[PDB]
C-alpha cells in the first residue's frame, strides 16, 4: 500500500480530460505509468527520474505526464478516446526495483 492510485476507476466520455494520480510513500526517485490491455503485458507510457522530469516511454502518444513533487506522478489524457479504455498501473522504483499500484480501470464512452 506504499503506492496509491487515484481514482481506482474512471468512466469518461469521449473528449473529457482525464488525470490519473499516482502517490507513493516509498521515497523512490523514479515513477512510472503503464497501460495493460486485456491479455497483454504492462506497456510503458511515460516515466520520471525525479521531480520536474518526465520522459517518454514506449507508447507515449495521446498521454502527457507530470512529476510535480517527489511523491506524485500524474498521467494526463487531454482528450479521452475509446481506444484509451484500459487498465493503467503506476509504479515507483530505483535501479531495477519496481513497486506497482493496484491499477485504475478506465472506460471511455
Which value, in Å, is the CA radius of gyration?
A: 13 Å
Q: How would you describe the shape?
A: globular
Query: Level of helix content?
Result: under 10%
Overall CATH class: Mainly Beta
CATH architectural label: Sandwich
Return the structural class: mainly beta
CATH superfamily descriptor: Immunoglobulins
Major pleated sheet: 7 strands, mixed
Q: What is the H/E order?
A: EEEEEEEEEEE
Pfam families: V-set (PF07686)
Protein name: Variable region-beta 8.5
InterPro entries: Ig-like_dom, Ig-like_dom_sf, Ig-like_fold, Ig_V-set, TCR_beta_variable
Keywords: Adaptive immunity, Immunity, Immunoglobulin domain, Signal
What does this structure look like?
- InterPro entries: Ig-like_dom (IPR007110), Ig-like_dom_sf (IPR036179), Ig-like_fold (IPR013783), Ig_V-set (IPR013106), TCR_beta_variable (IPR050413).
- Residues 1-92 form the Ig-like domain.
- Keywords: Adaptive immunity, Immunity, Immunoglobulin domain, Signal.
- The chain has 109 residues and is mainly beta.
- 0% of the residues lie in helices and 55% in strands.
- The protein has strands at 3-6, 9-12, 18-24, 30-36, 43-48, 55-56, 64-69, 72-77, 86-94, 97-100, 104-108.
At a glance:
With 109 residues, the chain is an all-beta fold. The protein has no helices and 11 strands.
Amino acid at each position: 500500500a506504499a503506492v496509491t492510485q487515484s481514482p481506482r476507476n474512471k468512466v469518461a466520455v469521449t473528449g473529457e480530460k482525464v488525470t490519473l494520480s499516482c502517490q507513493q510513500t516509498n521515497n523512490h526517485n523514479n515513477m512510472y505509468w503503464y497501460r495493460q490491455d486485456t491479455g497483454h503485458g504492462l506497456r510503458l507510457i511515460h516515466y520520471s527520474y525525479g521531480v520536474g522530469n518526465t520522459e517518454k516511454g514506449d507508447i507515449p502518444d495521446g498521454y502527457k505526464a507530470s512529476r510535480p513533487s517527489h511523491e506524485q506522478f500524474s498521467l494526463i489524457l487531454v482528450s479521452a478516446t475509446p481506444s484509451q479504455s484500459s487498465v493503467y498501473f503506476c509504479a515507483s522504483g530505483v535501479g531495477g526495483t519496481l513497486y506497482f499500484g493496484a491499477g485504475t480501470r478506465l472506460s471511455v464512452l
